[PDB]
């Protein structure tokens, strides 16, 4: 580009369409299951859906 | 108070194009809206129009002295970079106090 050799660096990201159950120590939720969902042929950003459990008390 | 030219130097580029400081661009916005409000109060203008003009003048002055107001939009400039207000000029590291004194 404009005589300058430019190299694209591969960028890490969490995989999509997979359910990942984490547990944040400092939060109102005990457990949270997230899913960054994205249609096969991308047209919009990743729509993250969370399904959490409220912490006891 | 509009500062002197030393606080906002107009640096000349390689050619003759004199680039103005962020403070000068912001003062240009402030003077524009101030004159606009002055004429709108002097001549025909609706109350809501004057209110919008006063709101924009408030935004310009606030973003001149402090640009990182939570929630509000950042005062923009050409190339999509936010302006450096008087507060960022001396806020922390690489400011006046820590970075030049």
């Amino acid at each position: 580009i404009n005589g300058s050799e430019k190299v694209l660096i591969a960028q890490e990201k969490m995989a999509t369409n997979t359910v990942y159950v984490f547990a944040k120590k400092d939060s109102k939720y005990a457990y949270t299951g997230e899913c960054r969902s994205c249609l096969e042929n991308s047209s919009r950003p990743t729509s993250t859906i969370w399904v959490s459990m409220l912490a006891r008390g | 108070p509009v500062p002197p030219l030393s606080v906002r130097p107009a640096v000349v580029m390689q050619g003759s194009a004199r680039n103005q400081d962020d403070l000068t661009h912001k003062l240009a916005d402030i003077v524009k809206i101030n004159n606009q409000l002055r004429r709108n109060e002097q001549n025909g203008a609706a109350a809501h129009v004057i209110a919008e003009d006063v709101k924009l003048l408030q935004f310009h002055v606030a973003t001149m002295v402090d640009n990182e107001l939570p929630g509000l939009p950042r005062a923009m400039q050409k190339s999509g970079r936010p302006l450096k207000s008087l507060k960022q000029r001396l806020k922390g590291k690489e400011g006046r106090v820590r970075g030049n004194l």
């Binding site: - | 130097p9 820590r98 030049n100 004194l101």
Partner: protein, 62 residues
């Protein structure tokens, strides 16, 4: 790649920045070296008040 000739630099009353009339930054700009906050603290501990004033007032931007 790190050869000393590309790193050696010296200054004695060279160009200064426009906004604050202090030495420039870099070898390429013939700039001066930064006498930072930690250097100020070191010289305060030394008790060298005139050297501290020379570095932070007289050798930078009188």
């Amino acid at each position: 790649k790190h050869m000393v000739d590309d790193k050696i630099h010296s200054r004695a009353r060279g160009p200064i920045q426009i906004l604050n009339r202090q030495p420039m930054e870099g070898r390429s700009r013939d700039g001066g070296l930064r006498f930072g906050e930690m250097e100020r603290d070191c010289q305060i501990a030394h008790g060298a008040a005139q050297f501290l004033r020379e570095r932070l007032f007289e050798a930078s931007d009188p």
